[PDB]
């Protein structure tokens, strides 16, 4: 049996983080917490979710189980759950998922996990630049950039960290030195990315949440978001855009 109780904010956060890339997904309930990951059908972005058991108000299982969930459905339902509302997820039989909150009980057919596209493997990315800042700031920088290009460049060296976008008539540049960042190794890196993925990523973060960036040169970027008061960890890995002829 699986019987956990979490807050609405926590549940609404992972369903969104996930649904942003995939429609169905394998959710793993492990001894140390909830885990899940998927790659969007573009084969461009990857999201890895981890919610440690202590984040849950209650987290009971008899063994480590894996379930196939229709995320579009869970997302749709979580809109009815309130932020400060407490929600109970229950999996008694092996074919239906129960979601409780308020005076409502929602049931849904599970998907045979084996039927869902085998999840990808957690990559091994050793990268130069390491940046830790407020997700809120990052969010604003991307939004500004979004008004200029469909792509931005993440640049990094001893001077600091920079996000830049270029139009044919104007440009915009975001910049922070070690003094302003929470942590900064001054590593050297440069990569280009699509602004649209970054915005979609930022939809699950706000001011006060921590963001850790792992950046390299012409390599995927690691955006590790720590949300809901440090109760959840949502990691997005995005493939880069490549210039050529």
């Amino acid at each position: 049996m699986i019987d956990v109780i979490m807050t609405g904010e926590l549940l609404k956060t992972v369903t969104r983080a996930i649904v942003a890339l995939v429609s169905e997904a394998r959710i793993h309930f492990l001894e140390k917490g909830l885990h899940s990951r998927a790659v969007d059908p573009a084969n461009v972005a990857m999201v890895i979710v981890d919610i440690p058991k202590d984040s849950f108000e209650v987290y009971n299982i008899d063994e480590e189980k894996t379930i196939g969930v229709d995320m579009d459905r869970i997302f749709d339902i979580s809109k009815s759950i309130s932020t400060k509302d407490l929600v109970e997820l229950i999996v008694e039989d092996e074919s239906t998922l129960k979601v409780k909150f308020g005076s409502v009980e929602y049931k849904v057919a599970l998907i045979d996990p084996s039927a869902i596209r085998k999840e990808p493997r957690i990559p091994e990315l050793e990268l130069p630049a390491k940046i830790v800042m407020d997700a809120g700031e990052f969010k604003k920088a991307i939004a500004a950039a979004d008004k200029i290009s469909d792509q931005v460049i993440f640049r990094s060296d001893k001077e600091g960290f920079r996000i830049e976008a270029k139009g044919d008539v104007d440009s915009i540049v975001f910049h922070m030195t070690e003094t302003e960042l929470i942590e900064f190794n001054g590593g050297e890196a440069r990569s280009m990315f699509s602004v649209d993925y970054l915005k979609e990523f930022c939809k699950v973060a706000g001011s006060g949440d921590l963001l850790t960036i792992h950046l390299g040169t012409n390599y995927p970027v690691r955006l590790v978001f720590e949300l809901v008061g440090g109760r959840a960890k949502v990691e997005y890995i995005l493939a880069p855009r490549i210039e050529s002829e």
Binding site: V44, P220, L238, R241
Partner: peptide, 12 residues
């Protein structure tokens, strides 16, 4: 030009 790379170009 500008192309979008696939994620498995690196996890390969």
């Amino acid at each position: 030009k500008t192309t979008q790379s696939t994620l498995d170009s690196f996890f390969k």
